[model samples]
Target: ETPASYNLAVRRAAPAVVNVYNRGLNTNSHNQLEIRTLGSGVIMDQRGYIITNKHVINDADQIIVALQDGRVFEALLVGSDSLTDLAVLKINATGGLPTIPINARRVPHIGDVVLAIGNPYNLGQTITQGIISATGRQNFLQTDASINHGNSGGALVNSLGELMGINTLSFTPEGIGFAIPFQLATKIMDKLIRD
Candidate 1:
């Protein structure tokens, strides 16, 4: 048999990955007036709901979400769970939106090939390859997906283009990255959408 390519997987998942720009007024003793981009988010539903790292949008006064098709919209903060480092957002884009299917029932295994999709360093939608370094990880999944400051709340997809987790933090010391497992993240995301 011939070797298979992950192109289809990337094509299926790439559209669901989005860019999240968190901006807020800087209140300080110096009285500076400026806003800055915080991080990225993953579009979990076509109804415009999104999942991201809570810390990425914490205290943000405004959220701007950009789709892979160059569509941008102002987003609202649905809810956030700092303990789990997860947050949910929503947009009002009409029509059916692209979404990445989450594989909450399946458990990730070590050395499983995965792709990290996000806007790293605000460089636009980018894909990085890696593998699941561990599973059943508490609060985060260990990987080597080249995660960075702007990649928070991005999608960590398996070889089949199924969402495995949400990228959140990184050790950086040894190029270690962590993502929120889909099982737990979906549960929290559902709560966020409901409440």
Candidate 2:
């Protein structure tokens, strides 16, 4: 029997997931700079704060974010921790901001169901499901669910659509992806909040 709440959780959280873009100008050797780069982010605060990869916005001078609702805005780097590869950004003018589920205890065991949500290859917000292939070693959760470029910093949820990890890396081999456990994110977020 399919429980009524089985799919309800993810449905509610999907809209909050978004694709983040780091906008900047490239400079020539003796001239001006021009170019752009795109990445991804997960809404971490109701006030329009996003959590993304540090590398995504590290060197970029301008930061922009695009929500699933077709809204766009300039994101300012509130704080960034290069050692952890995580960064936080905030948008000033905002109506609605996505919420990242806080699942501090829903750790996925090996073979447990998992989902990687993000915009892969710039396609759009996407969700991929798989079993927890491995765990308990470093700052990553190995899952079978596929992930790709541009998915960095997205949320990795479990069957209940609760965060289990943050999408950080993916291997070419099928069903092999690495995610930073949710606990780590909480720790980092806490530090950022205190600072």
Output the number of the TM-score-best candidate.
Answer: 1
Runs off by more than 4 Å, candidate 1: 1-4, 28-34
Which regions in candidate 2 have their CA more than 4 angstroms from the true location?
Answer: 1-9, 29-35
TM-score of each: 0.91, 0.86
The number of clashing residue pairs in each candidate reads 0, 5
Clashing pairs in 1: none
User: In candidate 2, where is summed lDDT lowest over 10 consecutive residues?
Assistant: 26-35
- Candidate 2, residues 39-147, lDDT tens digits: the string is 6787877877777888878777778788888888878887877777888888865565668777665656888777788888788888877877888645667887888
